[PDB]
Chain length 122, copies 2
């Protein structure tokens, strides 16, 4: 779920999602359309795509089992959904941490008056 994805993001980036990623760009925040603004936004799009690879999961409610193990994120579930959701979140958090170098605060709240040009495609 988002609480967990938030904790993974904290671990990889040092940021609290609700003060940063939660409102960022066209894909990290309340978006899902428009042009992905930069590498950070493209991570959030990639997560969207990743969630889309399996069918009859609910990433909003999926409370998976994971831990931090020597700075890795390890997804503990044997099933399909909880594990798949966890692996997508681990991937997205990793990706975000790789791209904190281009994190640009001017993409905060960008969806208010942008994100209207054609959407990214998985």
């Amino acid at each position: 779920n988002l609480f967990q994805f938030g904790d993974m993001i904290l671990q990889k980036t040092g940021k609290e999602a609700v003060h940063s990623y939660a409102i960022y760009g066209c894909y990290c925040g309340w978006g899902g359309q428009g042009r992905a603004q930069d590498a950070t936004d493209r991570c959030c799009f990639a997560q969207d795509c990743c969630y889309g690879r399996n069918l009859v999961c609910n990433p909003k409610t999926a409370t998976y089992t994971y831990s931090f193990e020597n700075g890795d994120i390890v997804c503990g579930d044997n099933d399909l959904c909880l594990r798949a959701v966890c692996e997508c979140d681990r991937a997205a958090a990793i990706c975000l941490g790789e791209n904190v170098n281009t994190y640009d605060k001017n993409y905060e709240y960008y969806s208010i008056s942008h994100c209207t040009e054609e959407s990214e495609q998985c």
Copy 2:
């Protein structure tokens, strides 16, 4: 997609989700666990469950068709995935509007230090 949900919320409440619901409680913002804090938070948890009902569907990318005409949100799609996500969003937006009277700014950023209780069950 969330950009559209945000527009439905703007239509119904005049709030910008990114400055409000996006970070509110345990279910509108970055939670998906813990208890639902108030009527606003319950609307968002209800939306999560509503999304979960919808198989073979990625709500993050689902760009549906809808119009906002004379009070009413009308979902135009026949596409099963788009229609249903559109109906979940429309229900949630109307629910948030109905409960704006108890919106409590103290639930903004609540997920950081709370939301660890046993979760709501669909």
